[PDB]
Design a binder for this molecule. Structure first.
Ligand code: HEM
Ligand code: HEM
Ligand code: CYN
Ligand code: CYN
Lengths: 169, 158
């Protein structure tokens, strides 16, 4: 049969570039078992994710109007239409297959931003779940090997958990 | 699935929170359905949890300052099993809250708290892959499990 993933170990090295500024982050990646192999997997999903980001962002803002105050927050500072563009690029930065200082530093920046505008952490956390769900949905439609499917899901739960760790608290 | 979510107006936001992770009756029924699977591997799930913590010396230090891994696996076994009870009520929420506050008083960092939930998920996804053949039921169980663990992080972060 055909496979979705390449297993090219030549291809999956050096995907963690962290200095001592980010000395805890290397521990954190080790605990969620985020490594070269998982990052290479992330990198190969990026096309799927890219091809589907518009559905992923639409679904995300749609979910948020379950809580009117989250929408007030958005409309006080911006608009959905304009947050989508930046969410597209953030989501896609998750599937780049490299964790480095800049990656971290950008995550700390968006954290501070949500802190400022008053997002409460439980809505922040809840919001990552529509992402997960839309991704799983994209995987299933496109990855019909059951074993490769699980592999895409596990990698994804890993990168999302690191995302949540970065923004908290 | 019956009437598995039984919250009073003091937990108004939690209701919204549930709707937003799509944790309703169907998903709770699924978790209930998974409970026997989960109970039959709880010892190993919890062995793996603490094993994984040992990679961060400061986490085990907090644990040994306050308690111990042997006493801690008894409450964790029970906590995880209650996760698949298939019912969310005021007391379920209320315990998660008290358990949270213990962790802030002991000085557990929320990054670490957060990573810790991934470990459980992984052990859980491992069991379902070994145990549930049909791909759709398999996705259904991971999705459910994923919802409840997200709730659990929300309530801790409250
Ligand atoms: C997984 C969840 C989320 C991610 C990854 C995320 C990410 C981002 C990013 C990358 C930006 C930067 C935009 C810029 O450059 O100005 C941003 C902006 C913003 N986000 Fe989020 N966001 C998330 C959830 C939320 C939620 C739940 C709300 C709703 C309250 C929210 C409200 C905002 C607002 C209002 C801004 C700033 C607008 C401005 O002043 O320009 N975010 N978010
Ligand atoms: C998925 C994450 C976690 C869950 C679900 C969890 C759950 C629990 C539960 C149910 C209790 C007992 C509360 C009670 O007495 O009612 C407990 C105890 C405790 N947990 Fe956690 N825990 C988690 C992560 C952690 C981590 C990562 C650490 C530190 C390495 C930690 C340290 C402790 C300690 C030291 C206590 C209190 C012992 C005492 O004061 O006697 N927990 N946890
Ligand atoms: C933040 N969109
Ligand atoms: C908390 N083990």
């Amino acid at each position: 049969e055909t496979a979705y993933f390449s297993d090219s170990n030549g291809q999956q090295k050096n995907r963690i570039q962290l200095t001592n500024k980010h000395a805890d982050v290397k521990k954190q990646l080790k605990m969620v078992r985020l490594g070269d192999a998982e990052l290479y997997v992330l990198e190969q999903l990026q096309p799927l994710i890219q091809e589907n980001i518009v559905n992923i962002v639409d679904a995300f803002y749609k979910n948020l109007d379950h809580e009117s105050s989250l929408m007030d927050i958005i409309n006080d500072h911006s608009s959905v239409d304009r947050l989508k563009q930046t969410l597209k690029r953030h989501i896609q930065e998750m599937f780049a297959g490299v964790i480095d200082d800049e990656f971290i530093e950008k995550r700390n920046r968006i954290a501070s931003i949500h802190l400022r505008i008053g997002l409460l952490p439980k809505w922040y956390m809840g919001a990552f779940q529509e992402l997960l769900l839309s991704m799983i949905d994209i995987y299933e439609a496109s990855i019909t090997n059951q074993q490769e499917l699980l592999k895409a899901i596990k990698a994804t739960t890993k990168i999302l958990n690191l995302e949540q760790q970065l923004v908290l608290e």
